[PDB]
Amino acid sequence: GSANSQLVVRAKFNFQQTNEDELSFSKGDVIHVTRVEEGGWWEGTHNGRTGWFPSNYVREIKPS
Amino acid sequence: NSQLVVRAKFNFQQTNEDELSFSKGDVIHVTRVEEGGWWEGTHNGRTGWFPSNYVREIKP
């Protein structure tokens, strides 16, 4: 695919935000990643907002 | 059988009866490696389940 493309991940489990800056999503939901970081939390966008989420709750939809 | 030993990276508090609570820095003897985010181990003679992403393997 196109190089250095923004990562696309799919939620594998439901998640309820524990903090204001965290995302809430349901299994099956698609998130566009804005920040990949070690430590178990990534940042992404979903449904119009940007927030943090558990990286172990998602699986990247890999190219190509 | 299992020669796998890991160290707790953070405190873990049980939320279910079969879970193995531990403190950061605890030494856990892994009894079963399983996919899903949870492994079984022994600390203080108690065997239970803990998050696999909460531990780091300790090499001999």
């Binding site: 439901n14 903090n19 939390w41 943090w52 558990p54 709750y57 | 985010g37 949870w38 992403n53 909460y54």
Partner: peptide, 8 residues
């Protein structure tokens, strides 16, 4: 049994 998120 969902995976446990690490502390932030």
């Amino acid at each position: 049994r969902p995976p446990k998120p690490r502390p932030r």
